[PDB]
Amino acid sequence: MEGVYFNIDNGFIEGVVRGYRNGLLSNNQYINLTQCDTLEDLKLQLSSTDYGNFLSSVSSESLTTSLIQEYASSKLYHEFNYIRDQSSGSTRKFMDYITYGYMIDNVALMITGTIHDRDKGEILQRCHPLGWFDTLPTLSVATDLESLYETVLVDTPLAPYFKNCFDTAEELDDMNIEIIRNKLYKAYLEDFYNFVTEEIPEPAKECMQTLLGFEADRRSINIALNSLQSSDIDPDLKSDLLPNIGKLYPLATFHLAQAQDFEGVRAALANVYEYRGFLETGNLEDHFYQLEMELCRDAFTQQFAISTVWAWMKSKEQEVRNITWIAECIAQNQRERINNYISVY
Amino acid sequence: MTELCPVYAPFFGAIGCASAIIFTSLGAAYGTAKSGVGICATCVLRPDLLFKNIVPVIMAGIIAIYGLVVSVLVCYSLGQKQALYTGFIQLGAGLSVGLSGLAAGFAIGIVGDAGVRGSSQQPRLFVGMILILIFAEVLGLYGLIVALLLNSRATQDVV
Amino acid sequence: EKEEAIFRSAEMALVQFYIPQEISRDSAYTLGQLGLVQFRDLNSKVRAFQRTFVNEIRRLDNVERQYRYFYSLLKKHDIKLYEGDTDKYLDGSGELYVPPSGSVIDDYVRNASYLEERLIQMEDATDQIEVQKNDLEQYRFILQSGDEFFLKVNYVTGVIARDKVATLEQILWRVLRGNLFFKTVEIEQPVYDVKTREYKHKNAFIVFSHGDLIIKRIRKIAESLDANLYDVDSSNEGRSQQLAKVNKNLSDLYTVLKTTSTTLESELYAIAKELDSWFQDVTREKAIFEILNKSNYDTNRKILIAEGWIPRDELATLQARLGEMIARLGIDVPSIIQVLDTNHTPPTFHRTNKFTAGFQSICDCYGIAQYREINAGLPTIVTFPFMFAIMFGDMGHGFLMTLAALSLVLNEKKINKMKRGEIFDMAFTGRYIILLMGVFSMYTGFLYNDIFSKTMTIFKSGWKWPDHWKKGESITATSVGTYPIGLDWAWHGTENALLFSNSYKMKLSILMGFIHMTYSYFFSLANHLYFNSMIDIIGNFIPGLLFMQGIFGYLSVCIVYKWAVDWVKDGKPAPGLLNMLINMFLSPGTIDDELYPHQAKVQVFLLLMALVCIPWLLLVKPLHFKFTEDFGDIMIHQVIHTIEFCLNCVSHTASYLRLWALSLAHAQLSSVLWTMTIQIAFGFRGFVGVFMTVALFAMWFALTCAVLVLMEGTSAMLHSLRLHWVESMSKFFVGEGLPYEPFAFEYKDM
Amino acid sequence: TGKAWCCTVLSAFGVVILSVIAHLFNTNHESFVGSINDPEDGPAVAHTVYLAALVYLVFFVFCGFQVYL
Amino acid sequence: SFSHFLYYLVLIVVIVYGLYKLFTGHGSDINFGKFLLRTSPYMWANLGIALCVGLSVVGAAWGIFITGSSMIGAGVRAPRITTKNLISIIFCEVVAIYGLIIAIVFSSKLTVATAENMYSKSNLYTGYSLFWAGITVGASNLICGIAVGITGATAAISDAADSALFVKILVIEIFGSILGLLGLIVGLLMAGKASEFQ
Numbered sequence A: 001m002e003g004v005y006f007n008i009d010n011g012f013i014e015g016v017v018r019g020y021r022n023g024l025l026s027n028n029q030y031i032n033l034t035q036c037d038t039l040e041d042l043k044l045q046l047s048s049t050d051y052g053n054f055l056s057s058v059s060s061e062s063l064t065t066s067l068i069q070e071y072a073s074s075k076l077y078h079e080f081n082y083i084r085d086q087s088s089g090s091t092r093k094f095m096d097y098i099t100y101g102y103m104i105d106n107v108a109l110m111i112t113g114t115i116h117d118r119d120k121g122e123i124l125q126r127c128h129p130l131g132w133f134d135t136l137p138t139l140s141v142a143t144d145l146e147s148l149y150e151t152v153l154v155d156t157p158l159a160p161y162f163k164n165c166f167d168t169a170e171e172l173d174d175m176n177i178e179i180i181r182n183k184l185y186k187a188y189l190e191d192f193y194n195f196v197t198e199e200i201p202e203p204a205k206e207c208m209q210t211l212l213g214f215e216a217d218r219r220s221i222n223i224a225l226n227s228l229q230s231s232d233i234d235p236d237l238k239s240d241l242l243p244n245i246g247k248l249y250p251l252a253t254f255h256l257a258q259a260q261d262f263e264g265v266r267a268a269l270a271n272v273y274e275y276r277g278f279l280e281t282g283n284l285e286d287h288f289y290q291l292e293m294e295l296c297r298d299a300f301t302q303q304f305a306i307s308t309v310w311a312w313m314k315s316k317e318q319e320v321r322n323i324t325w326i327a328e329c330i331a332q333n334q335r336e337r338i339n340n341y342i343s344v345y
Numbered sequence B: 001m002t003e004l005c006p007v008y009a010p011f012f013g014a015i016g017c018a019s020a021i022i023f024t025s026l027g028a029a030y031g032t033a034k035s036g037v038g039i040c041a042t043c044v045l046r047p048d049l050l051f052k053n054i055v056p057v058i059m060a061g062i063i064a065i066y067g068l069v070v071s072v073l074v075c076y077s078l079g080q081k082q083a084l085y086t087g088f089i090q091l092g093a094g095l096s097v098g099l100s101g102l103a104a105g106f107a108i109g110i111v112g113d114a115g116v117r118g119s120s121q122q123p124r125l126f127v128g129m130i131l132i133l134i135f136a137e138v139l140g141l142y143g144l145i146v147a148l149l150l151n152s153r154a155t156q157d158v159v
Numbered sequence C: 001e002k003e004e005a006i007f008r009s010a011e012m013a014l015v016q017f018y019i020p021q022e023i024s025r026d027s028a029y030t031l032g033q034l035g036l037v038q039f040r041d042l043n044s045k046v047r048a049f050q051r052t053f054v055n056e057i058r059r060l061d062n063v064e065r066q067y068r069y070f071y072s073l074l075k076k077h078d079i080k081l082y083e084g085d086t087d088k089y090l091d092g093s094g095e096l097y098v099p100p101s102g103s104v105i106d107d108y109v110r111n112a113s114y115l116e117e118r119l120i121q122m123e124d125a126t127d128q129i130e131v132q133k134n135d136l137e138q139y140r141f142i143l144q145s146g147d148e149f150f151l152k153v154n155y156v157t158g159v160i161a162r163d164k165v166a167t168l169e170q171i172l173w174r175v176l177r178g179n180l181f182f183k184t185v186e187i188e189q190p191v192y193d194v195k196t197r198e199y200k201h202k203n204a205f206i207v208f209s210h211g212d213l214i215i216k217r218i219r220k221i222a223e224s225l226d227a228n229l230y231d232v233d234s235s236n237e238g239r240s241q242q243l244a245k246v247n248k249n250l251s252d253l254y255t256v257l258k259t260t261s262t263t264l265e266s267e268l269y270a271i272a273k274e275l276d277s278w279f280q281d282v283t284r285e286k287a288i289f290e291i292l293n294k295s296n297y298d299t300n301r302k303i304l305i306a307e308g309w310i311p312r313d314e315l316a317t318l319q320a321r322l323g324e325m326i327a328r329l330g331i332d333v334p335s336i337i338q339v340l341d342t343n344h345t346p347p348t349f350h351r352t353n354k355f356t357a358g359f360q361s362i363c364d365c366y367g368i369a370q371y372r373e374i375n376a377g378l379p380t381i382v383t384f385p386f387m388f389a390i391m392f393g394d395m396g397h398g399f400l401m402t403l404a405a406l407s408l409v410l411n412e413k414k415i416n417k418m419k420r421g422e423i424f425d426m427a428f429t430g431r432y433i434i435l436l437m438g439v440f441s442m443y444t445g446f447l448y449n450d451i452f453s454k455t456m457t458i459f460k461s462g463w464k465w466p467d468h469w470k471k472g473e474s475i476t477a478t479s480v481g482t483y484p485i486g487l488d489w490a491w492h493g494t495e496n497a498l499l500f501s502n503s504y505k506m507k508l509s510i511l512m513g514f515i516h517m518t519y520s521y522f523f524s525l526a527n528h529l530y531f532n533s534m535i536d537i538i539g540n541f542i543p544g545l546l547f548m549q550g551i552f553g554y555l556s557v558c559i560v561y562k563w564a565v566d567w568v569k570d571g572k573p574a575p576g577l578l579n580m581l582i583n584m585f586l587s588p589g590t591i592d593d594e595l596y597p598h599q600a601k602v603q604v605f606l607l608l609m610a611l612v613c614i615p616w617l618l619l620v621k622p623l624h625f626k627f628t629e630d631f632g633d634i635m636i637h638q639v640i641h642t643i644e645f646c647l648n649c650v651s652h653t654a655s656y657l658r659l660w661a662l663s664l665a666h667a668q669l670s671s672v673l674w675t676m677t678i679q680i681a682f683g684f685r686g687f688v689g690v691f692m693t694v695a696l697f698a699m700w701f702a703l704t705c706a707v708l709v710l711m712e713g714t715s716a717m718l719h720s721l722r723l724h725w726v727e728s729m730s731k732f733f734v735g736e737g738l739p740y741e742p743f744a745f746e747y748k749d750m
Numbered sequence D: 001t002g003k004a005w006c007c008t009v010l011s012a013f014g015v016v017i018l019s020v021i022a023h024l025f026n027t028n029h030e031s032f033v034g035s036i037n038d039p040e041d042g043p044a045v046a047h048t049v050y051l052a053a054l055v056y057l058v059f060f061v062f063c064g065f066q067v068y069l
Numbered sequence E: 001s002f003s004h005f006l007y008y009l010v011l012i013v014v015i016v017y018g019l020y021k022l023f024t025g026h027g028s029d030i031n032f033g034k035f036l037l038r039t040s041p042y043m044w045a046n047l048g049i050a051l052c053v054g055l056s057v058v059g060a061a062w063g064i065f066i067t068g069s070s071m072i073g074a075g076v077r078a079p080r081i082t083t084k085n086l087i088s089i090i091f092c093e094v095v096a097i098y099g100l101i102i103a104i105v106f107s108s109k110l111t112v113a114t115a116e117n118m119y120s121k122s123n124l125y126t127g128y129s130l131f132w133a134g135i136t137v138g139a140s141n142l143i144c145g146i147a148v149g150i151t152g153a154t155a156a157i158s159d160a161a162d163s164a165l166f167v168k169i170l171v172i173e174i175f176g177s178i179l180g181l182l183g184l185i186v187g188l189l190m191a192g193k194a195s196e197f198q
C-alpha cells in the first residue's frame, strides 16, 4: 500500500520536508511581520520564526528588501538542494523535473536579456539558481535558435522538450522567445506528467497529476491571454503552446485555441467550474495563487506521498514572495495593501 | 538409511548452516551499503562526524556475527548419520537466524541512513538514531535466541 | 541549609524584583552571576521589536556580528585566537566580580564599528590586489607555455577552471562544428580566488579560429564561463618580450601585496590577543539586556518589575548577595525582594553531584519531571546498571568495563581540565554510570559463574558424577546439595546446560521485572500521597495494583513457589507455569497440574478481580469527576489510559524477557568467541604453537573489547535505558515539566 | 604514543589471562581438560601458554619502557 | 515481465501435468494426502517455528524502519519528538517479542519420537498445529508490525507539528497492536491441544 514501501527510500525526505512545511509562516506570524515599522524590525521578527538568524550577518544599513529576498530565496534553494541531495532514484528524478521548470524560465530570461542587451550582473542575479545548466551564462551571447539548440539545449536535459520549434523563422525576437518558452514548457509538462504517471506511485501519482493539470490550465490561460493582445497568433499554432495534460484538455483547450476574445476565452473556460470565477471578477493571478495554495494544503493532507515536496516548494516560494512584498511595503511605508498576502497555513 | 536417519537428513543441516550465514550476510551488506551511502553523503558537509556516524555500519556487522555463531554451532551436530529431527532442528535454527538477521540488517540500514543524514543537521538525533538501531538489532538478537533454543534440542534424546 | 533535592525537585518560590533603572544593569549582572534565577517572561504580551530594551539588544547583536566577522577574518587569514581569562569572571559559582561599566561597553561598540570599517576597507584593498596578482600570474603561466602549445587574431588563449574545461571544449566544438583545435594544459598549483573565497584548479586553453565574427563569437563564449582571456604576441620573441613585461610589474605588485598583508596581519594579531574577552563581555551585556527585556516596566515610575524562579533554599543567599551589591553601589532602594505565591508551574530542579549527574541526564533525556514529583534518577542509579548487568552478566567483560570506567574515575580531574570530544565528553560524564555497570556486571558474572565465558569452581558443586563410566557415555549427575553462591559450575559444558540456564534466566527476568514494576508503581502512590490526590489513589492505583498483583504478581509467586517444592520427592507432577498462565485466561477453572491446593478457586478469583478492576479503573475516576464538555475529555482520556495500561501490562512483562535474551546472546557469543579464538591455540604446540597462541589471544582480546565489552555492552546499556524509559517511567513519570534553566553566565566558545 | 599504550595494556592483560589459563592447564582443571574434545595433554599446553605469556611479558616490558621514556 | 512469464509458464505446466495424470487414469497419483502423511512432522514443526520468529522479526523491523525514518526526518526541526515517539518503536518490537514467546512455547514441544510412532495421529496433529500456528503468528505479527509502523510514522510526523496529535494517533497504534495480540492468542489456541511428539 501507500507507506509500506515509501519509507525505505523517501521516509527521511518526507519527514524533513513536512518539518519544513511546519516551518511555514502562519497567519499570526504574517500579521506580526505586517505590524513592523522598519526592515530591521522585520529581520528581528523573522529571527523568532523558523527562518532563524539568516540575516544575522547582514548589517542594519545593508538590510534592504532586495537583499532580504535574496537571503530568503537562498535559504529556500539550499533547503531544496539538500533535500534533493539526500534522495535518489524516482525521488531524485522528481526533483530534477521540478528544477527543469525553473531552468526553462532561466534560459528564457537569459535570451530575453541577450536581445535586450541588459546588464550581465543583473541578468545573472535575476535568474533562478535552482535551474542551472552548465552553459547557462553562455546564453548571454547566443541568439539564433538553431545555434541555440545545437550548442546549448542538446547538452541540457531540456533537449527532449525541443522538438517542433524548428518550423519557425531562424531569426529570433521577443515573440520567438516567448513562443519557444511556451512550446518548451508544454513539452516539459507532458514529459513530467508521463514520468509521474509511470514512475511516481499512488497516492502521489494522482495528487501530482492533479497539480500538473492545474499548472497546465494556469499556463494555458496565461498564454491565451498574453497572445490575445497580439494580432500575429494562429489558432492552430497555439495548440502547440497550450499544454495538453491539464483538465482543460481536450475540449476547453480546443475552444481556447479557437478563442479570439476575452468573452471567447471565458466561454472556452466555461467547461470547468473552478476557472470561471477567476475570469469572472477579481485579480486573476491572485485567484491562481490562492487555488495553488489550497491545492498544496490538500496535498499535505496525504501521508507517504512525494507530492508533499512540490506542495512545500510552491508554498515556501509563495512565502518568500509574501516576505518580499511585506518588506517592500514597509520600506516604502505604503501599507495600504500590505495585507495583500496569500496564506493557508 | 534408517527411517529415523535418512540419507537426505544432512541436507537440512548443511543448508541451515549455509543459510544462517547467507541471509545474515545479505542483511549486514544491505545495512553496510545504506549506512555507507549515508555516511559518505554527510561527511562532505560535516567531516567531523565521520567516526561518530559509523555506528550503523558496526551494528549491521553484528548481524553477521550472529549468523556466523549459528553456522558454527550448527556444524557441531552435523553428521552423515544424523536423524531427520536433528536435520530439521538445524534447518529451523538456520532459517530463524537468517531471516531475522536479514530483517534486522534491512532495518538497521534504513534507519542508520536516515539517522546519519538527520544527525548532521540536528545533533540531538544521534541518541534517537542509536536507540532505533538498537531496537532493530535486538530483532536479529531474538532470531539468534530462537536459533540457540532450537540448537539446544538438536542432539538430545536422538537415536 | 540547602535542601538535598534528589528524591524530588527543589522547592521553588516565585520572586519579584523591583529593580530601578538606576541600578538595573548592576542588578542584572548580579542575578546572572548568581545563576540561581530562572526569569519569567512577564513581557510576553507585547510582540517583538517593541520591547523596552530592543534597541540596546540590537546594538550588541550588531557588535556580536562584527566580532563574528573578525573571527572569520582571523580564520581565513590563519591566526590562532587567544582565549580569554575564564578565571577573571570565575565562570560560575555565586561569587560576584566587578562588572564592566557602561562607558566600557560604549567604547567596545565604537571600537568594533570603527575597526570593522578599517578591516573591510583593508580587506577590499587586499582582495583587489590579490585578484589582479592572480590574473597576472595566469597571464605569466600562459606566456610560459611551450612553443608547441600555440602551434596546430588567430586564437582565444586564456585560463578556465577544470570544472568547466570539458564543457567549454564541447560547446566550442558544437559552435565550430568540426573546426575545433582546442588545446589545453593544466596549472599544477591550486589557484585561489577572492570572488568565491575558495581555491579552484584552472586549465589554460587555446582554440584556433580565423573568422572575425567567429573569433568574437568564441571570445564571448569563453568569457561567459568565468574565463580570464589574455592576448599573446603570436611569436616566440613576442612571447619573451611580453613575459619580460611580466615578472617586473609582478615584482611591484608582490611588494605592495606584502606590505598590505603585513599591515593587515598586524591588525589581526592585535585583535587576536583581545577578541575573546571583548566577545565574552558583549555576550554578557546582551544576555543581561535580554533578561531585562522580560520585565514589566512602569512608564509612570522608574521600576523594572521582574519575576524569577529561584529555589526557596537560595532565597536567603540571593537576598544577601543583593544586599552586598547595594552596599557596593551605595544607592538606597526600597524592598527589592518580595516573595510571591502564584499558581504557575515551578521548574523542575534536582541538585546533582558528580555521581548522580549522569543518571539524571539519562532520566531527563526522556522527559523533565513535574514540580515536586518522584525523581526517576534516584532509583535509576542502581536499577539501570543492574539491569544492564543482568543482560551483560560476565565477570571478565565486567572487569574490563570496571577498569575502563576506573581509568576515567580516578583521572577525572585531568579530564575535567582538558577539552573533551563528543564521544569523550560522553562516557566521562557517565564515568560513574559505567563504573556501577561494571561492578554489577562482575557481581552477576559471579552469580552466573561466567568468567570470559568460562566457569569458576570456587565452591563445592551440588552435582556428583557417577562413580565410573566408559568414555563417550552419556552420564547424568545426581544431586548432593545446593551451590552456595551463583549457578553451579557442574552445569558447564553439559548437553542440558541450556535447558536449565534458559529457564533460570527467563524466570529471573520475570521476577526482577515484576519487582521493578511494582517498585515503580509504588512511586505513583508516593506521588498521589504527596499531591493529596486521593481520588487518583482510589481510581488508578488500587485497580492497577490489584490487576498486576493478580495477573502478573500471581505468576511471580507461582514461579517462586515451584522452586521451593521438591516435586520429585513429593511425587506430584511438575506444573508448567506457562500453560497454567495460558489456561488462567483461555480456559478458566481448568488446571491440568496442581501447583497447590484450591488452585482453580484462587485462579478464578484473581481473574474475576482483574475483570472487575478493569471497569473500576476505567469508570470510577470519571464517575467522581462527574459527581464532584470536560467530562467527555476526561472519560476518553481514562479509556485511553485503561486500554494502554491493560495492553502494556502483558507487553511490559513479555518485553522484560529481553534480559534473558541478551544474557543468553552475550554468553553464547562469549563461548563461541573463546572456541574460535583461544581454544584453537591449545591444540598447537612448539614454536608455531606459541606464535599461534599469541596471535589468537591478541585477536580474541581485540574482538572481546570491540564487540562484547564495548558493543554488546552498548546494546544492553540502551536496552536498560528502554526498560527504564518505557517499562519503568510510564508507571510513575507524569513528565511534561519545565526544565530549570537559570540565568547564569558561561564561557561561550566562538 | 597511543600504539605503545594500547600494546602495553594488551600485553599486560595477556600476561594475566594467559598465565591464569596455563596455571589451570597445569593443574588439570575440569573446565579446561575435563572433556574428550579438550586437549589431552595438560602440562604440554601449560608450557605452551607459559611461553606465550613470556612473549607477552617481553612485549609488555618493552612497551612500558617505551611509554616511560 | 520475466516474473509474470515465469508464473504463467508454471501455471501452464501444472495444468498440463494435472490433465495428463487425470486423463491417463493416474489422477490419484497427485496425492496431497500421501504427501502430508509421509512428510515428517518435524519438518512442519520446525518450519512453523522458524517462519513464526522470522516473520515476526520481519514485521517488527518493517515497522521499526518505517517509524524511525519518519521520526528522524521530523526530528531535524523538532528533536523533542524522538523520546515521545519511541512508544511507536516499542509497539513495533512487541510483535517480535510475541514471535519469540510463541517460538519458545512451540520449541517446548519438540521431543524426539520413536520410529514406530513416527507418523502417528498425535504426531501428525502436532506437526500440522505447530506449522500452521507458527505461520499464523508470524504473518499476524508481520501485518501488525507494518500497520503499527505506518501508524507510528504518521504519529511522529503529526506530533512534530503539534504534540496534541500523538495522544490521538496512539489510539490507532494501540488498535494496530491489538492485531498482533490477537494473532498470538489464536496461535496459542491452535497449539494448546497439540501435545509433544511421542
Ligand SMILES: CO/C1=C\C(C)=C\[C@@H](C)[C@@H](O)[C@H](C)C/C(C)=C/C=C/[C@H](OC)[C@@H]([C@@H](C)[C@@H](O)[C@H](C)[C@@]2(O)C[C@@H](O)[C@H](C)[C@@H](C(C)C)O2)OC1=O
Pocket (backbone or CB within 6 Å): B051, B052, B054, B055, B058, B061, B062, B064, B065, C423, C705, C706, C707, C710, C711
Ligand atoms: C578495522 O577493524 C574495525 C572494525 C571491524 C572490521 C570489526 C569487525 C570485527 C566487524 O566484522 C564486527 C562485526 C563489528 C565490530 C566489532 C566493529 C568494531 C569496530 C571498532 O570499534 C571498536 C573500530 C573502531 C576502532 C573504528 O571504527 C573507529 C576509529 C572508532 O574508534 C572511532 C570512534 O570515534 C568511535 C566512538 C568508535 C565507535 C563507533 C565504536 O569507532 O575498529 C575498526 O574500524
